[PDB]
C-alpha cells in the first residue's frame, strides 16, 4: 500500500475531570482565635463562662 | 500488485484498530439490552 508519515495531533477541547465545587470553607466559623504563637504548646484556652444553681 | 487487484487492507485501518479508539455500542435494537462492550469502558490512557 501507500505508507504515510503523519504528525501525531493533540488537542484541548475542553474536556476536563469533573471536579468538586467548594462551599464549606465559608460556612464554619473561621479564625475567632489567632495568637497561637505567644501561648505554650500552641493552644489558647477558650473561657465558658459559670452559671449557678438556685 | 496490479491495478486490478482488489482492495488492499489499509495500514492506516489496522493502525487505528490497534489503537482502540473507535468507537464500540450497544446494539439498539437488541432485547433484552447488551452488556457494555470492552472498549467502550477502556480507561483514558496515562499518557499519549
Known sequence: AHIFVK???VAEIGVKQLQRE?????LVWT???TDFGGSKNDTITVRVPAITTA | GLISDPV?????????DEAGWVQELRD???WPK???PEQAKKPAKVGN
Open chain 1, 7 to 9: 504528525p501525531e495531533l
Open chain 1, 22 to 26: 467548594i462551599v464549606l470553607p465559608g
Open chain 1, 31 to 33: 479564625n475567632p482565635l
Open chain 2, 8 to 16: 488492499e487492507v489499509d495500514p492506516i485501518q489496522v493502525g487505528r
Open chain 2, 28 to 30: 439498539r435494537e437488541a
Open chain 2, 34 to 36: 447488551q452488556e457494555v
